[PDB]
Design a protein around this motif. Structure first.
Motif, mmCIF file in Angstrom:
data_model
loop_
_atom_site.group_PDB
_atom_site.id
_atom_site.type_symbol
_atom_site.label_atom_id
_atom_site.label_comp_id
_atom_site.label_asym_id
_atom_site.label_seq_id
_atom_site.Cartn_x
_atom_site.Cartn_y
_atom_site.Cartn_z
ATOM 1 N N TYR A 269 5.803 5.229 -5.685
ATOM 2 C CA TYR A 269 5.723 6.335 -4.749
ATOM 3 C C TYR A 269 6.878 6.224 -3.770
ATOM 4 O O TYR A 269 7.535 5.178 -3.691
ATOM 5 C CB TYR A 269 4.369 6.360 -4.022
ATOM 6 C CG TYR A 269 3.231 6.533 -4.993
ATOM 7 C CD1 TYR A 269 2.658 5.417 -5.592
ATOM 8 C CD2 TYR A 269 2.758 7.794 -5.346
ATOM 9 C CE1 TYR A 269 1.647 5.537 -6.516
ATOM 10 C CE2 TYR A 269 1.735 7.935 -6.288
ATOM 11 C CZ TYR A 269 1.203 6.782 -6.880
ATOM 12 O OH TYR A 269 0.168 6.818 -7.787
ATOM 13 N N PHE A 270 7.180 7.291 -3.053
ATOM 14 C CA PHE A 270 8.297 7.259 -2.122
ATOM 15 C C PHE A 270 7.868 6.712 -0.783
ATOM 16 O O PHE A 270 8.662 6.085 -0.086
ATOM 17 C CB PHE A 270 8.879 8.650 -1.878
ATOM 18 C CG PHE A 270 10.015 8.644 -0.920
ATOM 19 C CD1 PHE A 270 11.178 7.952 -1.230
ATOM 20 C CD2 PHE A 270 9.898 9.236 0.324
ATOM 21 C CE1 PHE A 270 12.236 7.919 -0.327
ATOM 22 C CE2 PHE A 270 10.954 9.217 1.211
ATOM 23 C CZ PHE A 270 12.113 8.540 0.885
ATOM 24 N N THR A 271 6.669 7.079 -0.336
ATOM 25 C CA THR A 271 6.240 6.563 0.930
ATOM 26 C C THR A 271 4.772 6.314 1.033
ATOM 27 O O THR A 271 4.023 6.598 0.107
ATOM 28 C CB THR A 271 6.784 7.377 2.109
ATOM 29 O OG1 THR A 271 6.800 6.533 3.296
ATOM 30 C CG2 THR A 271 5.993 8.710 2.276
ATOM 31 N N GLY A 272 4.396 5.645 2.108
ATOM 32 C CA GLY A 272 2.996 5.230 2.294
ATOM 33 C C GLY A 272 2.720 4.926 3.748
ATOM 34 O O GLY A 272 3.660 4.749 4.518
ATOM 35 N N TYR A 273 1.442 4.867 4.103
ATOM 36 C CA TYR A 273 1.022 4.610 5.476
ATOM 37 C C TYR A 273 -0.430 4.118 5.430
ATOM 38 O O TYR A 273 -1.151 4.361 4.464
ATOM 39 C CB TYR A 273 1.094 5.884 6.329
ATOM 40 C CG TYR A 273 0.165 6.968 5.835
ATOM 41 C CD1 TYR A 273 0.537 7.774 4.758
ATOM 42 C CD2 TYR A 273 -1.091 7.168 6.385
ATOM 43 C CE1 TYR A 273 -0.299 8.770 4.267
ATOM 44 C CE2 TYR A 273 -1.950 8.173 5.881
ATOM 45 C CZ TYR A 273 -1.527 8.959 4.808
ATOM 46 O OH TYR A 273 -2.319 9.993 4.281
ATOM 47 N N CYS A 274 -0.801 3.412 6.470
ATOM 48 C CA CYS A 274 -2.118 2.889 6.648
ATOM 49 C C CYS A 274 -2.937 3.975 7.360
ATOM 50 O O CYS A 274 -2.644 4.357 8.487
ATOM 51 C CB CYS A 274 -2.086 1.632 7.483
ATOM 52 S SG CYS A 274 -3.654 0.749 7.452
ATOM 53 N N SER A 275 -4.206 4.284 6.508
ATOM 54 C CA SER A 275 -5.189 5.140 7.157
ATOM 55 C C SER A 275 -6.481 4.409 7.318
ATOM 56 O O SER A 275 -7.101 4.052 6.327
ATOM 57 C CB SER A 275 -5.402 6.415 6.386
ATOM 58 O OG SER A 275 -6.326 7.230 7.095
ATOM 59 N N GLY A 276 -6.899 4.232 8.575
ATOM 60 C CA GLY A 276 -8.016 3.376 8.923
ATOM 61 C C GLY A 276 -7.662 1.934 8.590
ATOM 62 O O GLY A 276 -7.020 1.231 9.385
ATOM 63 N N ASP A 277 -8.069 1.496 7.404
ATOM 64 C CA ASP A 277 -7.656 0.181 6.938
ATOM 65 C C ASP A 277 -7.271 0.142 5.474
ATOM 66 O O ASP A 277 -7.285 -0.913 4.902
ATOM 67 C CB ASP A 277 -8.726 -0.889 7.260
ATOM 68 C CG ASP A 277 -9.940 -0.838 6.323
ATOM 69 O OD1 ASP A 277 -10.175 0.184 5.628
ATOM 70 O OD2 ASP A 277 -10.655 -1.867 6.256
ATOM 71 N N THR A 278 -6.837 1.279 4.917
ATOM 72 C CA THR A 278 -6.480 1.378 3.520
ATOM 73 C C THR A 278 -5.134 2.049 3.372
ATOM 74 O O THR A 278 -4.858 3.028 4.096
ATOM 75 C CB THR A 278 -7.517 2.243 2.785
ATOM 76 O OG1 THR A 278 -8.824 1.709 3.062
ATOM 77 C CG2 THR A 278 -7.273 2.218 1.302
ATOM 78 N N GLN B 20 4.253 -1.332 -0.440
ATOM 79 C CA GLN B 20 3.221 -1.389 -1.476
ATOM 80 C C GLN B 20 3.271 -0.143 -2.330
ATOM 81 O O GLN B 20 3.083 -0.212 -3.514
ATOM 82 C CB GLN B 20 1.829 -1.549 -0.883
ATOM 83 C CG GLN B 20 1.611 -2.877 -0.194
ATOM 84 C CD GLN B 20 1.481 -4.044 -1.164
ATOM 85 O OE1 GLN B 20 1.295 -3.883 -2.372
ATOM 86 N NE2 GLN B 20 1.555 -5.231 -0.623
ATOM 87 N N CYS B 21 3.490 1.004 -1.702
ATOM 88 C CA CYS B 21 3.599 2.283 -2.412
ATOM 89 C C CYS B 21 4.893 2.363 -3.243
ATOM 90 O O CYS B 21 4.860 2.851 -4.368
ATOM 91 C CB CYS B 21 3.522 3.431 -1.411
ATOM 92 S SG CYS B 21 1.905 3.480 -0.596
ATOM 93 N N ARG B 22 6.012 1.889 -2.687
ATOM 94 C CA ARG B 22 7.308 2.013 -3.345
ATOM 95 C C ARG B 22 7.377 1.153 -4.591
ATOM 96 O O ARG B 22 7.915 1.617 -5.585
ATOM 97 C CB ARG B 22 8.478 1.738 -2.405
ATOM 98 C CG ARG B 22 8.646 2.812 -1.344
ATOM 99 C CD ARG B 22 9.882 2.628 -0.523
ATOM 100 N NE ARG B 22 10.148 3.866 0.199
ATOM 101 C CZ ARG B 22 11.163 4.054 1.044
ATOM 102 N NH1 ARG B 22 12.008 3.087 1.303
ATOM 103 N NH2 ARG B 22 11.312 5.235 1.659
ATOM 104 N N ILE B 23 6.784 -0.030 -4.586
ATOM 105 C CA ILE B 23 6.799 -0.887 -5.851
ATOM 106 C C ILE B 23 5.900 -0.274 -6.928
ATOM 107 O O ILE B 23 6.138 -0.473 -8.127
ATOM 108 C CB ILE B 23 6.475 -2.377 -5.620
ATOM 109 C CG1 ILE B 23 5.041 -2.606 -5.151
ATOM 110 C CG2 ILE B 23 7.498 -3.013 -4.686
ATOM 111 C CD1 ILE B 23 4.617 -4.064 -5.192
ATOM 112 N N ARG B 24 4.962 0.596 -6.497
ATOM 113 C CA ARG B 24 4.109 1.392 -7.403
ATOM 114 C C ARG B 24 4.697 2.760 -7.704
ATOM 115 O O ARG B 24 4.017 3.654 -8.261
ATOM 116 C CB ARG B 24 2.714 1.530 -6.799
ATOM 117 C CG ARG B 24 1.975 0.221 -6.772
ATOM 118 C CD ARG B 24 0.718 0.391 -5.969
ATOM 119 N NE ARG B 24 -0.173 -0.753 -6.046
ATOM 120 C CZ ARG B 24 -0.092 -1.861 -5.305
ATOM 121 N NH1 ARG B 24 0.914 -2.078 -4.422
ATOM 122 N NH2 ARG B 24 -1.037 -2.783 -5.472
#
Length: 38
Positions: free
Chosen positions: A24-33, A18-22
């Motif tokens: 960004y290089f990376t992403g992760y789930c925090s809590g539920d976001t 989801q982050c990479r198509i936007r």
């Protein structure tokens, strides 16, 4: 990180994609976001 307000679960964390198509290089789930960085 920024948050993008896509719902997620850490147990099946699909935030990186989801982050990479936007552009960004990376992403992760925090809590539920999804968070993104880079």
């Amino acid at each position: 990180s920024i948050s993008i307000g896509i719902k997620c679960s850490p147990s099946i964390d699909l935030c990186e994609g989801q982050c990479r198509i936007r552009k960004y290089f990376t992403g992760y789930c925090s809590g539920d976001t999804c968070h993104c960085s880079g």
